[PDB]
Amino acid sequence: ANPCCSNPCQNRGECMSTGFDQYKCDCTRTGFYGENCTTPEFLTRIKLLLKPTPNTVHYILTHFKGVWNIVNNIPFLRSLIMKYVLTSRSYLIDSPPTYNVHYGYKSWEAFSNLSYYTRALPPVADDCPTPMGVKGNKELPDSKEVLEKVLLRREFIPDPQGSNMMFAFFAQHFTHQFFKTDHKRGPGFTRGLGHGVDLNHIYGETLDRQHKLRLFKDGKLKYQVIGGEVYPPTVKDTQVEMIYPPHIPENLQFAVGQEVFGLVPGLMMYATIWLREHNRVCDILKQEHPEWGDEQLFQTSRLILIGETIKIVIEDYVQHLSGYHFKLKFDPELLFNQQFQYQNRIASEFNTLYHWHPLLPDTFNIEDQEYSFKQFLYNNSILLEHGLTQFVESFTRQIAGRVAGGRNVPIAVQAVAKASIDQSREMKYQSLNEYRKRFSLKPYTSFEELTGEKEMAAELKALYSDIDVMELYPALLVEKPRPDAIFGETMVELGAPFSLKGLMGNPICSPQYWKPSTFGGEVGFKIINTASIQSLICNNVKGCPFTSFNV
Amino acid sequence: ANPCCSNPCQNRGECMSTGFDQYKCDCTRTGFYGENCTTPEFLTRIKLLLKPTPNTVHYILTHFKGVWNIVNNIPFLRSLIMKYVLTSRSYLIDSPPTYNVHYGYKSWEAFSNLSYYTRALPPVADDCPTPMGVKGNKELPDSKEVLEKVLLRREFIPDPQGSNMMFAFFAQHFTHQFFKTDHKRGPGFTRGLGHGVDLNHIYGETLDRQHKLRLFKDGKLKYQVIGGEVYPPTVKDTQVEMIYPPHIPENLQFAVGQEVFGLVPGLMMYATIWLREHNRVCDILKQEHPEWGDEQLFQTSRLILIGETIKIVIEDYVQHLSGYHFKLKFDPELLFNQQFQYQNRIASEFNTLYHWHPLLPDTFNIEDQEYSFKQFLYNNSILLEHGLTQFVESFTRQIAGRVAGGRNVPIAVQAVAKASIDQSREMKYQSLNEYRKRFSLKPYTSFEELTGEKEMAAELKALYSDIDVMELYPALLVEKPRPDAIFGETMVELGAPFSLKGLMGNPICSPQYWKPSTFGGEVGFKIINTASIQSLICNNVKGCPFTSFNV
Ligand code: HEM
Ligand code: HEM
Ligand SMILES: [C]OC(=O)[C]C1=C([C])N(C(=O)C234[B@@]56[B@@]78[B@]9%10[C@@]2%11B92%12B7%109B857B925B673B%11%1254)C2=[C][C]=C(O[C])[C]=C21
Ligand SMILES: [C]OC(=O)[C]C1=C([C])N(C(=O)C234[B@@]56[B@@]78[B@]9%10[C@@]2%11B92%12B7%109B857B925B673B%11%1254)C2=[C][C]=C(O[C])[C]=C21
Ligand SMILES: *[C@@H]1O[C@H](CO)[C@@H](O[C@@H]2O[C@H](CO)[C@@H](O)[C@H](O)[C@H]2NC(C)=O)[C@H](O)[C@H]1NC(C)=O
Ligand SMILES: *[C@@H]1O[C@H](CO)[C@@H](O[C@@H]2O[C@H](CO)[C@@H](O)[C@H](O)[C@H]2NC(C)=O)[C@H](O)[C@H]1NC(C)=O
Ligand SMILES: CCCCCCCCO[C@@H]1O[C@H](CO)[C@@H](O)[C@H](O)[C@H]1O
Ligand SMILES: CCCCCCCCO[C@@H]1O[C@H](CO)[C@@H](O)[C@H](O)[C@H]1O
Ligand SMILES: *[C@@H]1O[C@H](CO)[C@@H](O)[C@H](O)[C@H]1NC(C)=O
Ligand SMILES: *[C@@H]1O[C@H](CO)[C@@H](O)[C@H](O)[C@H]1NC(C)=O
Ligand SMILES: *[C@@H]1O[C@H](CO)[C@@H](O)[C@H](O)[C@H]1NC(C)=O
Ligand SMILES: *[C@@H]1O[C@H](CO)[C@@H](O)[C@H](O)[C@H]1NC(C)=O
């Protein structure tokens, strides 16, 4: 019955009911005007016919290697171009945040309640005739059929960008500090009240957990020594609650910041590495400041590790994902002379698009062993068996799977994928093309255009009938990938602004924070500004083994 | 023992211990360099000799009535100058926030923990030899002696700006939504987790309280009718927790958003007025949107009332306080093309400086009655006796007291004033001159310069011995006022930036919020943009009595 069910307002204009059968669109500062905000202004037209498509920019950034080879060696040009790149991802995310799963309109409840995931697009109203609004049938196609037809992996499809398990597990570990759904409340709620990179997955969400994890000497975290190697402490030793099956021995119940990192040895690997890094930084700082107490050492170390995290994510992780020849640079100073809100609210769609389970292989190859999913899950005895060095050397060698392209979701976690669909419907997500229009992307006019392929497109056309009823998540998983790339256009163009707000929106990137004294002086600052995955592993793993995000 | 005890770093440079007996100043982006950041740059020198003093600007804004009479009638000039005024209060407050009572250095605990008041200046370290750092004696002078010698009121000193009781109670009411100290935790802690103007003192801090206060019909708040007049509901009807003496009858235990507003009839007056305003706006919106449900009506009404509150605060409240001939304007669009952080964390010093208890008269004069403090406190039967109309008519006539100039704190609240001293020392506040330097003000070289008077200055010199040991709050209360004004320089130049961050930092002032559709269309937007204390009283108080913030 709601006259806004068809999402009539275009170009981010806001829809408002003006009666039972009438609507009005607020076209304030959209650059457009008219009934549904479709008539462009002069400056709008000018900026329109002069704006390059994301595929053109991507092509430019993945080609002309010599030009970028010259650019990367000129600090001025590199800084300028990096500033342009940062700018291109700005002004796409509502900050301060607006809607959530319970509010299709702006309200103080939606703004103040930090328990909600925020929403890039408002949910479809409950009284709408169809799940997507007014288009499509009364019900969306069977999620099981979608899953089995176009999502489930027949044969392992390797990532053409050469991503490995170091990358996959880094992605899981890193994202699971702000993607922490409160299943007690619902899919649209989060337990990560920090809504960003606070390293709560290392230090704990609450203060009591943090204290239980701390040694309260030299700023360090508690740890145990097995076979001369440093590992996280146990649940029995710290009373830190962790999620483990009842058949897991006490000496194998490692306790870390995030309570679910006992699930995968790959997660416990990075947990251990980051623990060791925190204590290392504590040693360095203690040597620099012998007059410092435990608390200051701990806090400063935490800030430093946050810095390292953002640094590595930008210049290694995203650098690998992008396939750019241009070297991305982590430098907050590039945003000081521009408008930028230093705050962030984790979006539900950001969570949804980051379900990169196709990265997972059928088996996990460590040294000379091939473990199944059943054998690998909740098995830290594997980590103790092979050790951190062998784990790094093995995960560096094993290639991960392609995320986009379709049919590469491992069967072992099929129930997860289906959930990603079901919950998406439960949270009343708008359609794919709506989210593309939301991020200034051209809507798909057919399923073949979406897939760049005829078979899966035919299946999807049989299931959804209309392209404007296609859902976001499976579209993300079956989308035509960029040339020999892991992702398609939608994944990148949606994930990048969210990532920008989630990284550069961190308070340590603010002018009053971004200075040496914040991190204990020039030494800590240098620890941040010289951070890399290779340096992390080299400094914290025995023998300094070679590591990378690609095979 | 801490080498930073003497506060060596000048011009907002940051001090860091580099050993047990050495320190270093981070002068990053301060405009200065050298050991303690005292050596200015060329551009810094240029900006320094061209910057007018706050007293000069105050003079220019409080004189030349004809010129300003011309300015206020030209939208362009008024917008320009208002933009300048807004800009002059920017770049003073740390946003995102930094320090608090327990952290004199930046840390994630200080940033993320919302239970803290933030701090404009870091606290004096615990191991410092003197309360202020290194200057002064081992202990600050007796707070009772300071109180009795320069703070306590002898004869009532009226405000030369003619501020009335409507103004005073509006001040208390408005400020007590973000000034809510958690005395269970300590004076450095707050219960206002929203840290700003969320109107929690009307709608309740939490969701349960709000839901208890709501009618869940037409978006309205619950209310009762007494003698034909609308008043807030009872504790018996809503089960809302309020603070009342044990002898207060159940039919007099009114339930409002803030648990302490029943202790002062002046507060209950405004609580009633704002309740009525909310329900009125609910009626208007319901007429505009017959298709809307209870929840959206409620939320939209809330946002609108926030708007009205900020509007009234800027164009009537602060307009009266300033004494400017220039007409201040509430317009978020003035900041849309400038760097501004739409977030706010309430500072402890902001709380301290806003203790304007000298505003209180010896008696409260209503119609033909003069109530003492003992008679006026916890007595809402007075409000029911005279009614809202007579209350407004009386409080409009009765003049309030001067805040600066010394010796005007009423004896009935001496215990409060003393606390303001004691707790200030408990939270380890830095000295008056440190806070003056922090906000780009010239340090006082004597107590006579501070007071502009010989007697109180002599007493203060006998007490503190050194002017650099003078505390912030009593200095605020005894400071030489501006010519025929209520405040001194420090009060204004410290209070104004805090207020800027507290008013324009509100999310409804952000470009994605500041639009008609946020407030249910052009009608609600007009309600916000045409709000005033006069219209607020006229719309909701019977007879539409004339009101103002001055006599
Ligand atoms: C052995 C490897 C993995 C397993 C067994 C696994 C399994 C799961 C499970 C069971 C969930 C929770 C489903 C639910 O709560 O409804 C989940 C959620 C998720 N997984 Fe994976 N996953 C793995 C690796 C990864 C990887 C490599 C990524 C890549 C970034 C990833 C991203 C996510 C995300 C974003 C969520 C949503 C979690 C939340 O909102 O709290 N996972 N995974
Ligand atoms: C009408 C009579 C008033 C009384 C009886 C009164 C009394 C008090 C009391 C008892 C406190 C708490 C002090 C403590 O717990 O240590 C207090 C706090 C305060 N008062 Fe007043 N006050 C009055 C009016 C005002 C006015 C007009 C203002 C200024 C607008 C004001 C501003 C404050 C502030 C800012 C606080 C601290 C709030 C907090 O931290 O929770 N009060 N007042
Ligand atoms: C989840 O999102 C992703 O898949 C990772 C990703 C990010 C992030 N970006 C970026 O565009 C960024 B984000 B970071 B860094 C570089 B700078 B900084 B923010 B600015 B913006 B720009 C890209 C760009 C291209 C590609 O592959 C085609 C992937 C990614
Ligand atoms: C407690 O603080 C006060 O004493 C209230 C106060 C505020 C606030 N301002 C301001 O300068 C501001 B900041 B905010 B708002 C008003 B507008 B907006 B920014 B523009 B600028 B202008 C002044 C200016 C002068 C005076 O007294 C002479 C008092 C105040
Ligand atoms: C944020 O919103 C959620 C959902 O509206 C609130 O959780 C509800 O809290 C009430 C008690 O006030 C319970 O009766 C409900 O069962 C809860 N619902 C869910 C889904 O958990 C939550 O309290 C809000 N948070 C804040 C800080 O107000
Ligand atoms: C914010 O800081 C306060 C003070 O450190 C925390 O409250 C303390 O919490 C510990 C429990 O972890 C208690 O034992 C202390 O008694 C509390 N102190 C006081 C004075 O309240 C509070 O938990 C912190 N908030 C968050 C969200 O971490
Ligand atoms: C300013 C214009 C510069 C154009 C540079 C060449 C950009 C060509 O961009 C093309 O975009 C296509 C879109 O589908 C992709 O499929 C191709 O891979 C890509 O080459
Ligand atoms: C206001 C009632 C308490 C004040 C009396 C105790 C403190 C005495 O204080 C004295 O008060 C004198 C008279 O005001 C002043 O002239 C002196 O400067 C002051 O020291
Ligand atoms: C868009 O506007 C046109 C005319 O301005 C109107 O015919 C059309 O119905 C609008 N779109 C929707 C979805 O209502
Ligand atoms: C866990 O891993 C070990 C190898 O160290 C293996 O022997 C064991 O069977 C695994 N546990 C399960 C339940 O498969
Ligand atoms: C400020 O610097 C000067 C010279 O560099 C030095 O003499 C002085 O001691 C410093 N200030 C403090 C408080 O130490
Ligand atoms: C409260 O005020 C009434 C007048 O309205 C007065 O009669 C009564 O004595 C007062 N109560 C107290 C305790 O002073």
Short mmCIF file of C-alpha atoms in Angstrom, two decimals, chain A residues 12 14 16-20 26 28-29 94-98 103 105-109 111 114 197-198 207 210 288-292 295-296 299-300 302-303 306 333 335-343 506-508 510-518 520-521, chain B residues 12 14 16-20 26 28-29 94-98 103 105-109 111 114 197-198 207 210 288-292 295-296 299-300 302-303 306 333 335-343 506-508 510-518 520-521:
data_model
loop_
_atom_site.label_atom_id
_atom_site.label_comp_id
_atom_site.label_asym_id
_atom_site.label_seq_id
_atom_site.Cartn_x
_atom_site.Cartn_y
_atom_site.Cartn_z
CA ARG A 12 19.69 9.12 -4.07
CA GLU A 14 14.53 10.51 -0.77
CA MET A 16 8.27 10.26 1.35
CA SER A 17 4.57 9.37 1.46
CA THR A 18 2.21 12.34 1.15
CA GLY A 19 -1.03 10.43 1.65
CA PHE A 20 -2.21 6.86 1.15
CA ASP A 26 13.33 15.18 -1.89
CA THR A 28 18.06 18.18 -2.09
CA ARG A 29 21.72 18.35 -3.17
CA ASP A 94 26.08 8.30 4.56
CA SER A 95 28.13 9.61 7.49
CA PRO A 96 26.67 10.16 10.11
CA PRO A 97 24.67 6.95 9.40
CA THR A 98 20.96 6.86 8.56
CA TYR A 103 13.83 2.09 9.95
CA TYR A 105 13.33 6.62 7.41
CA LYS A 106 15.86 8.67 9.35
CA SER A 107 15.29 8.62 13.11
CA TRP A 108 17.24 9.16 16.32
CA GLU A 109 16.77 5.49 17.19
CA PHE A 111 21.35 6.86 14.63
CA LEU A 114 24.90 1.07 18.08
CA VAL A 197 39.11 -1.55 13.32
CA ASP A 198 39.59 -1.51 17.09
CA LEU A 207 37.18 -4.23 29.45
CA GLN A 210 40.72 -7.41 28.05
CA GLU A 288 62.21 3.33 24.54
CA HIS A 289 60.31 4.32 27.69
CA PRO A 290 61.69 2.67 30.85
CA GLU A 291 59.70 5.23 32.86
CA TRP A 292 56.42 3.90 31.47
CA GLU A 295 48.88 0.52 31.16
CA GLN A 296 50.52 3.10 28.88
CA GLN A 299 47.45 1.21 25.16
CA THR A 300 50.24 2.60 22.99
CA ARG A 302 47.27 -1.27 20.82
CA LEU A 303 47.20 2.00 18.86
CA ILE A 306 45.79 -0.68 14.82
CA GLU A 333 47.68 13.38 5.71
CA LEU A 335 42.71 13.78 3.73
CA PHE A 336 43.58 16.68 6.04
CA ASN A 337 42.85 19.35 3.43
CA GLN A 338 39.53 17.79 2.40
CA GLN A 339 36.08 17.11 3.87
CA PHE A 340 36.06 13.71 5.57
CA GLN A 341 34.10 12.44 8.57
CA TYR A 342 36.31 10.52 10.99
CA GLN A 343 33.56 8.12 12.05
CA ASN A 506 39.51 5.46 12.20
CA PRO A 507 40.29 8.15 14.82
CA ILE A 508 44.03 7.41 14.57
CA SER A 510 42.55 12.16 12.43
CA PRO A 511 44.98 15.14 12.50
CA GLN A 512 45.03 15.31 16.31
CA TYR A 513 45.88 11.61 16.48
CA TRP A 514 48.17 11.12 13.47
CA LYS A 515 51.44 12.18 15.11
CA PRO A 516 54.53 10.49 16.65
CA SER A 517 53.68 11.20 20.30
CA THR A 518 50.43 9.26 19.90
CA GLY A 520 55.20 6.63 21.83
CA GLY A 521 57.44 8.68 19.56
CA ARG B 12 49.01 22.75 22.01
CA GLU B 14 52.17 17.40 23.13
CA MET B 16 56.05 12.91 26.08
CA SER B 17 58.45 11.44 28.63
CA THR B 18 61.69 10.28 26.99
CA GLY B 19 63.25 8.76 30.08
CA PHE B 20 62.91 9.39 33.81
CA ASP B 26 55.56 17.01 19.50
CA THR B 28 53.23 18.64 14.63
CA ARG B 29 50.84 21.04 12.88
CA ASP B 94 39.55 17.81 19.63
CA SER B 95 37.17 15.80 17.45
CA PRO B 96 37.43 12.77 17.62
CA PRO B 97 38.10 13.29 21.37
CA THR B 98 41.33 12.44 23.19
CA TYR B 103 44.31 9.17 30.60
CA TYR B 105 47.81 10.38 26.89
CA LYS B 106 45.82 9.20 23.87
CA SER B 107 44.52 5.63 24.04
CA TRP B 108 41.71 3.50 22.64
CA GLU B 109 40.12 3.21 26.08
CA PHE B 111 38.30 7.23 22.82
CA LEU B 114 31.46 6.74 26.30
CA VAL B 197 21.31 17.32 22.33
CA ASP B 198 19.28 14.12 21.95
CA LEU B 207 14.45 2.53 25.08
CA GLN B 210 11.01 5.96 26.41
CA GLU B 288 0.07 16.09 7.10
CA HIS B 289 0.50 12.30 7.02
CA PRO B 290 -2.74 10.41 7.75
CA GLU B 291 -1.02 7.32 6.32
CA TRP B 292 1.76 7.39 8.92
CA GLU B 295 6.39 5.10 15.49
CA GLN B 296 7.28 7.33 12.53
CA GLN B 299 10.55 9.72 15.69
CA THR B 300 9.89 12.56 13.25
CA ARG B 302 11.60 13.95 18.11
CA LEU B 303 13.94 15.04 15.31
CA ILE B 306 15.74 18.61 18.42
CA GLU B 333 24.26 24.94 5.26
CA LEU B 335 29.21 24.55 7.22
CA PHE B 336 28.54 22.30 4.22
CA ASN B 337 31.50 23.69 2.27
CA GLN B 338 33.91 23.61 5.22
CA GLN B 339 35.78 20.99 7.24
CA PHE B 340 33.61 20.14 10.23
CA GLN B 341 33.21 16.93 12.22
CA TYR B 342 29.56 16.07 12.85
CA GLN B 343 30.25 14.39 16.19
CA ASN B 506 24.41 17.20 15.92
CA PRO B 507 23.75 14.69 13.10
CA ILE B 508 20.58 16.54 12.02
CA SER B 510 24.71 17.07 8.49
CA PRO B 511 23.88 17.41 4.74
CA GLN B 512 22.24 13.96 4.56
CA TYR B 513 19.96 14.88 7.46
CA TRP B 514 19.34 18.59 6.90
CA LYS B 515 16.51 18.25 4.38
CA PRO B 516 12.67 18.55 4.44
CA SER B 517 12.02 14.80 4.10
CA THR B 518 13.88 14.12 7.35
CA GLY B 520 8.19 14.96 7.31
CA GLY B 521 8.33 17.59 4.59
#
